[PDB]
């Protein structure tokens, strides 16, 4: 049931390089954030 409203793209009408990056916050739980900045990672403390 998590992936009902998972596959969308940005409709606002113009908007930078958007791209799949790995976030890790405090926890073990990471997230699939799109950021502007290609890294494949970025870990928070």
Same mark, same amino acid.
């Not at 502007?36 to 494949?40: A, D, Y």
């Given at each position: 049931d998590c992936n009902r409203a998972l596959l969308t793209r940005l409709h606002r009408q113009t908007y930078a390089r958007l791209y799949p990056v790995l976030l890790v916050k405090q926890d073990g739980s990471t997230i699939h954030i799109r950021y502007?900045?290609? &890294? &494949?990672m970025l870990t928070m403390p």
């Open positions: 502007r900045e290609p &890294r &494949r």
